[PDB]
Amino acid sequence: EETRKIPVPANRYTPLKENWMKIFTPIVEHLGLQIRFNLKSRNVEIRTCKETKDVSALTKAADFVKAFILGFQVEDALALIRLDDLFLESFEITDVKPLKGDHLSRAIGRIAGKGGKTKFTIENVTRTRIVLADVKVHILGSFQNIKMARTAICNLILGNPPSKVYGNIRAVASRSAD
RNA sequence: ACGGUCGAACUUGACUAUCUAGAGGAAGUAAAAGUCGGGUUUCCGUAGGUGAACCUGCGGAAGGAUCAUUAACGG
Numbered sequence: 001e002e003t004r005k006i007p008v009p010a011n012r013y014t015p016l017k018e019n020w021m022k023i024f025t026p027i028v029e030h031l032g033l034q035i036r037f038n039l040k041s042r043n044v045e046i047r048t049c050k051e052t053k054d055v056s057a058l059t060k061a062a063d064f065v066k067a068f069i070l071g072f073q074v075e076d077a078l079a080l081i082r083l084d085d086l087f088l089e090s091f092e093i094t095d096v097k098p099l100k101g102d103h104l105s106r107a108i109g110r111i112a113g114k115g116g117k118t119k120f121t122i123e124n125v126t127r128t129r130i131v132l133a134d135v136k137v138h139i140l141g142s143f144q145n146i147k148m149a150r151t152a153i154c155n156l157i158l159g160n161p162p163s164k165v166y167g168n169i170r171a172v173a174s175r176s177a178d
Numbered sequence: 179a180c181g182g183u184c185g186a187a188c189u190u191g192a193c194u195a196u197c198u199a200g201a202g203g204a205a206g207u208a209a210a211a212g213u214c215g216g217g218u219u220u221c222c223g224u225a226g227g228u229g230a231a232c233c234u235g236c237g238g239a240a241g242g243a244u245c246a247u248u249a250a251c252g253g
Contacts, residue, residue, distance in 0.1 A: 011248040116245030
């Protein structure tokens with residue numbers, strides 16, 4: 001029996017505690033994996049028991065809990081539980097353009113937009129989920145959808161206004177046999 | 179008449195300033211319906227790319243649209 005341990009930061013302890021039943025129930029019910037949260041090591045531990053139905057379910061659960069810790073909602077990583085062709089690609093915001101200080105903050109703003117609206121628009125077009133950590137961007141979706149979302153985000157964080165980005169991603173989504 | 183003094187003005191070169199004729203050159207204008215025919219958020223300073231514009235490099239600005247998380251840490 002093998003196990004996987006994944007860490008949790010201090011800012012994700014309370015979301016883990018509130019959503020704990022919605023996390024451990026799908027892992028143990030139909031995947032059949034033991035789960036605990038070590039408070040000393042601050043780790044979510046997932047284990048294979050005799051009740052595990054099939055191999056690689058523990059990898060599925062590990063991706064689910066890792067996606068929840070990175071900042072995604074519990075149902076958007078339950079999508080990683082159910083679907084097979086889903087991945088979790090992430091990058092830093094300074095990876096494409098060296099931005100210092102206030103400029104960097106403005107880049108973060110034009111991933112969000114007003115009220116988060118711009119971000120949601122990309123999530124509507126690329127069919128992905130984007131999480132903005134403090135200087136990090138995480139995309140959950142299919143491989144081509146991750147490519148479209150990262151193209152939109154990289155276009156946003158090197159200077160393009162949101163309307164041009166919307167038009168470009170709508171043209172690409174029309175061309176992508178969606 | 180010698181000499182001294184005040185000194186107009188005259189001649190010669192330089193510095194000039196003004197007035198006044200000009201062969202020629204480079205132009206433009208009116209007359210010829212004569213001949214041939216897509217990219218960009220907005221900038222600043224410096225440098226290069228054929229002068230400017232524009233593009234790129236380097237360093238700066240916003241005069242550019244912040245969503246989500248963050249009470250435990252004791253045995």
